[PDB]
Design a protein around this ligand. Structure first.
Ligand SMILES: OC[C@H]1O[C@@](CO)(O[C@H]2O[C@H](CO)[C@@H](O)[C@H](O)[C@H]2O)[C@@H](O)[C@@H]1O
Ligand SMILES: [Ca+2]
Length: 440
């Protein structure tokens, strides 16, 4: 096919920027710090469960919420023997506490019967609960967003919401139940891929990776939004053979396009690149948390990867910062290995863009430890703070199902300094496992 150029009015993780990362990531400024394995404990209240992807109850601006004197963290958890066993649990600590042992376990957010009682057609076919966010409303309610995964329908993923009813006393929190439990968005075909388009390809046998998950709630000027992991649809630069000739996905120059595109077309990664159309999508919600407006993606990753996860966005000191986690094993970029794991980041003067790369390339964090390493971390998440130039990076530690005595747990948190369009890991800033704030 003939070369063309089309941005679709959105930002892009370009091949040229990603190719700069292999050399850049040797700089300790952009490296997840080494952790000390002999300080690492299992979450004592989680009782033999793997606990991975986690997120704090957040205020509208992303700072950590105070629920009746408690911090609350939602986390995926399940049997280490069963990789398809995933439910959201709610942990909580008193404000002031920092030890991993301070985290009590209120149990699952949902009963099995909740999805049926919701009178929601998609929800009644759910088989797993995957990641999202949680915001603390102005009328004092815990408002959860998460991913409804259905294994019965070829891995359908649906952005979902519920209010979690929680009684608070001097000693404990107790989940009483949920309400307003409903599907919000399952893709539209034109902006964000839906599950039927995945099935059109031949589902899992095709090599395609359909995502519509990890919704993150944020507000600006009283407007409510979710920003989430997705994939592009037919009208904002879809996957396919033709996608490899779109110079917007390469950047730099036409000379770089010709060279990189012909290399890619001759490589064993041609098909992978064709299928790769990850996106950080966006929708506006109404005041009852239903869908107001499908919006254009903030950024896309055509040709480089199909999987940019754990969308996160917030305002900090007059600028908007947009983050995503991604595995080098699923990328098509020379020099990036299957061991490499990233938090990528971008910056704008507005929530809705346009976003340009942090640290010139997109690199913020790199982690490349062996999957077998007990101190392996993934799912890095920047928790904004009330004031200052630091955010707190949370992550989970130790791969799921790897070790009988060492489960997936809260990683030691650490600090990331952010100023303008640059970031750096703060020297020797390792905090307690699962610590959410600098202030104690
Ligand atoms: O467990 C699902 C949950 O984990 C995340 C990020 O850790 O994605 C993981 O699981 C996906 C489905 O198995 C994989 O495709 C991905 O490589 C892995 O990181 C979230 O995106 C998801 O909600
Ligand atoms: Ca795809």
């Amino acid at each position: 096919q003939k070369p063309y150029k089309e941005t679709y009015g959105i930002s892009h993780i370009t091949r040229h920027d990603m190719l700069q990362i292999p050399e850049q990531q040797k700089n300790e400024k952009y490296q997840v710090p080494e952790f000390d394995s002999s300080t690492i404990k299992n979450i004592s209240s989680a009782k033999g469960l793997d606990v991975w992807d986690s997120w704090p109850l957040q205020n509208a601006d992303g700072t950590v919420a105070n629920y009746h004197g408690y911090h609350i963290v939602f986390a995926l958890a399940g049997d280490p023997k069963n990789a398809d066993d995933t439910s959201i649990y709610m942990f909580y600590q008193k404000v002031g506490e920092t030890s991993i042992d301070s985290w009590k376990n209120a149990g699952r957010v949902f009963k099995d019967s909740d999805k049926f009682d919701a009178n929601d057609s998609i929800l009644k076919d759910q088989t797993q609960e995957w990641s999202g966010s949680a915001t603390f409303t102005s009328d004092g309610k815990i408002r959860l967003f998460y991913t409804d995964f259905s294994g019965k329908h070829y891995g359908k993923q649906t952005l979902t919401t519920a209010q979690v009813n929680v009684s608070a006393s001097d000693s404990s929190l107790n989940i009483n139940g949920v309400e307003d439990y409903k599907s919000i968005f399952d893709g539209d075909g034109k902006t964000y891929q839906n599950v039927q388009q995945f099935i059109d390809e031949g589902n899992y046998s095709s090599g395609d990776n359909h995502t519509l998950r990890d919704p993150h709630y944020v507000e600006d000027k009283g407007h409510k939004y979710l920003v989430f992991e997705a994939n592009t649809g037919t009208e904002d630069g879809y996957q396919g053979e033709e996608s490899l000739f779109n110079k917007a996905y390469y950047g730099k120059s036409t000379s770089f396009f010709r060279q990189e595109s012909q290399k890619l077309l001759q490589s064993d990664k041609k098909r992978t690149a064709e299928l790769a159309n990850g996106a950080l999508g966006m929708i506006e919600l109404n005041d009852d948390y239903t869908l107001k407006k499908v919006m254009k993606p903030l950024i896309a990753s055509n040709t480089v990867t199909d999987e940019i996860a754990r969308a996160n966005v917030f305002k900090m000191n007059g600028k908007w910062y947009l983050f995503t986690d991604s595995r080098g094993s699923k990328m098509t970029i020379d020099g990036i290995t299957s061991n490499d794991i990233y938090m990528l980041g971008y910056v704008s003067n507005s929530l809705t863009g346009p976003y340009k790369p942090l640290n010139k390339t997109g690199l913020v964090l790199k982690m490349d430890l062996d999957p077998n390493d007990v101190t392996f971390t993934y799912s890095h998440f920047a928790v904004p703070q009330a004031k200052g130039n630091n955010v707190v990076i949370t992550s989970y530690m130790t791969n799921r199902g790897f070790y009988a005595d060492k489960q997936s747990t809260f990683a030691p948190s650490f600090l990331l300094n952010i100023k303008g369009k640059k970031t750096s890991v703060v020297k020797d800033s390792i905090l307690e496992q699962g610590q959410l704030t600098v202030n104690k």
